[PDB]
Amino acid sequence: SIEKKEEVIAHNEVVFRSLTQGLYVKEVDIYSDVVSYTKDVDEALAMPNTINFKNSRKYKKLIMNLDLEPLNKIQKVIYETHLEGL
């Protein structure tokens, strides 16, 4: 018996994976081309994607790159209340 359910979003950012290598980007150069890779979601390069930051410019040359696979990362907390009788 679920009584109350609330869903909350902690973070919302975009992470880019290479189709071939399967790694995540961690760093880029002056031209925004990749300098490094990392196989860790927590350390990967991130573009903020909360509502105020949509339609960015900093990573246009990155997004257009076909080898890269953008991924929308979302972190959530949900609260579930229960009643179990006597």
Partner 1 sequence: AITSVDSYLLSEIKPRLNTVLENCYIIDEVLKDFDYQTRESFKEAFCGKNAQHEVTVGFNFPKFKNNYEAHYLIQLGQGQETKNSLGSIQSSYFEATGDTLVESSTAIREDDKLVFTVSKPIGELIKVEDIEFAKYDNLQVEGNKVSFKYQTNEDYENYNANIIFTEKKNDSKGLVKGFTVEEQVTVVGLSFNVDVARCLDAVLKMILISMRDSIEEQQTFQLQNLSFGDIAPIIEDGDSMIFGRPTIIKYTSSLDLDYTITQDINKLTFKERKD
Q: How far is the CB of 61 from partner 1 (least distance, A)?
A: 9
Q: Which stretch binds partner 1 (CB under 8 A): 1-9, 54-62, 66-74, 76-84?
A: 54-62
Type of residue at 42: D
**Shortest gap between Cβ of 24 and partner 1 (angstroms)?**
14
What is the number of alpha carbons within 13 Å of residue 57 lying toward its C-beta? Answer: 0
Q: Which one among 3, 6, 7, 29 touches partner 1, defined by CB under 8 A?
A: 29
Q: What stretches of the chain adopt beta strand conformation (E)?
A: 2-18, 24-28, 34-38, 47-48, 68-82
Token digits of residue 31: 């031209």
Q: Cβ of 14: how many Cβ atoms within 10 Å?
A: 19
Binding residue for partner 1 (CB under 8 A) from 21, 22, 53, 67? 53
Residues that bind partner 1 (CB under 8 A): 28-32, 48, 50, 52-53, 56-58
